[PDB]
Symmetry: C2
Subunit: 67 residues, 2 copies
């Protein structure tokens, strides 16, 4: 796992980027968002996630909102 | 994105394998399952999925139960 903050998230398109502690921004698709809530994220929201390597490069998997 | 069928899934533990015609089985964790509803899958279930490579190797992402 890794911790980061949502840089931006567009809930109409369903994706955004997560800014991380010392590395490139990580892409985040709505399909990775955990929880029963609507699968959206807010700019600035802290999230815990795992970095996975998808066919277009790095991606967020298992994205959870931290309290 | 591609289709496959659930080979087996352990409901208590929340993981299983997707069998792909002509290819290798793909590990699937409950966290990748899309939809509203309890995150589980039955053997024989047709699914669509993406494949990503994490710290543990290849695994399914964006798993949707298909009819």
């Amino acid at each position: 796992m890794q911790r980061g903050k949502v840089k931006w998230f567009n809930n109409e398109k369903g994706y955004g980027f997560i800014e991380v502690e010392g590395g490139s921004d990580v892409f985040v698709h709505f399909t990775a968002i955990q929880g029963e809530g609507f699968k959206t994220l807010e700019e600035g929201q802290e999230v815990s996630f795992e970095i996975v390597q998808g066919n277009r490069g790095p991606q967020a998997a298992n994205v959870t909102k931290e309290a």
